[PDB]
Design a binder for this molecule. Structure first.
Ligand code: ZN
Length: 181
């Protein structure tokens, strides 16, 4: 299952939105499990469901895969919104449980307004060794390359989109760095 170009552009657009998002907080998560021995990487994505938030559905997917724990793995997660406090705590517990699994978290946007629970969740994830980094051009390009359907042409120019995303990420990186300590 692959995303469309328009869905990718709408979800990962990091140009600071003006009109507040309405409930529920729609959040996309694309993940890539890469086996370190070289076998086929597994890719997927999850949205916010009333059943589970994207991070929780991702954690449950990794748990249900039943990984060969004699191997080592690299996991990369591209999120549209950075995780909330509860998802951050669940991710910290998931990181601690799996010492054969090196996790990297990237986020397109952090949040519309700053909050103590979300900032403390991000600080907890940072102290555990998996800080929520901001997506730049390499991360947007990798997520575009591997998760979008390219059999059919896009309705827009992808290079201008990647340029706009990279341009907007520069200030969001400063917003993230002002907090991290
Ligand atoms: Zn959440």
């Amino acid at each position: 299952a692959l995303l469309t170009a328009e869905t990718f552009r709408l979800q990962f657009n990091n140009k600071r939105r003006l009109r507040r998002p309405y409930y529920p907080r729609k959040a996309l998560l694309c993940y890539q499990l890469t086996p370190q021995n070289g076998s086929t990487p597994t890719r997927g994505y999850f949205e916010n469901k009333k059943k589970c938030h994207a991070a929780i559905c991702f954690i449950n997917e990794i748990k249900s895969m039943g990984l060969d724990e004699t191997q080592c793995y690299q996991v990369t997660c591209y999120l549209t919104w950075s995780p909330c406090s509860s998802c951050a705590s669940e991710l910290v517990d998931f990181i601690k449980a799996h010492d054969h699994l090196n996790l990297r978290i990237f986020a397109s946007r952090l949040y519309y307004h700053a909050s103590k629970p979300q900032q403390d969740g991000l600080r907890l994830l940072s102290q555990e060794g998996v800080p929520v980094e901001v997506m730049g051009f390499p991360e947007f390009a990798d997520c575009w390359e591997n998760f979008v359907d390219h059999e059919k042409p896009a309705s827009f120019n992808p290079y201008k989109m990647l340029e706009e995303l990279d341009k907007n990420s520069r200030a969001i990186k400063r917003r993230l760095d002002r907090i991290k300590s």
